[PDB]
């Protein structure tokens, strides 16, 4: 599914992330349009061999299981076909375990280079929230 800007946002607010770790919802908004421009379908296979899924691009060597990236630790106990589904729910309870590793939305390469320091409230400027 292709979200919309405020239609993502909304989902994202009633699955809890809206402050999660102190990251406002623009955060969250901003990585999903640089990660995946809001296509819960998306796939990118990495330089070493796993791959990256969904809505935030959540990837085979740590999170999710697809059975072709060896040694990976499936750290959210889910496959990573789940992770493309229309709904949300899975991404959105992975992104809660990353995003509490340590490092924060570092682990998140866009957020970092596009994302992080800039006005990120104006991804939710204009929806009814």
Same mark, same amino acid.
């Given at each position: 599914k292709v979200f919309g800007r405020c239609e993502l946002a909304a989902a994202m607010k009633r699955h809890g992330l809206d402050n999660y770790r102190g990251y406002s919802l623009g955060n969250w908004v901003c990585a999903a349009k640089f990660e995946s421009n809001f296509n819960t379908q998306a796939t990118n296979r990495n330089t070493d061999g796993s791959t990256s899924y969904g809505i935030l691009q959540? $990837? #085979? %060597?740590?999170?999710? $299981?697809?059975?072709?990236?060896?040694? #990976? %630790? $499936?750290l959210c106990n889910i496959p990573c076909s789940a992770l493309l589904s229309s709904d949300i729910t899975a991404s959105v309870n992975c992104a809660k375990k990353i995003v509490s590793d340590g490092n924060g939305m570092n682990a998140w390469v866009a957020w970092r280079n596009r994302c992080k320091g800039t006005d990120v409230q104006a991804w939710i400027r204009g929806c009814r929230l």
């Open positions: 959540i $990837n #085979s %060597r740590w999170w999710c $299981n697809d059975g072709r990236t060896p040694g #990976s %630790r $499936n």
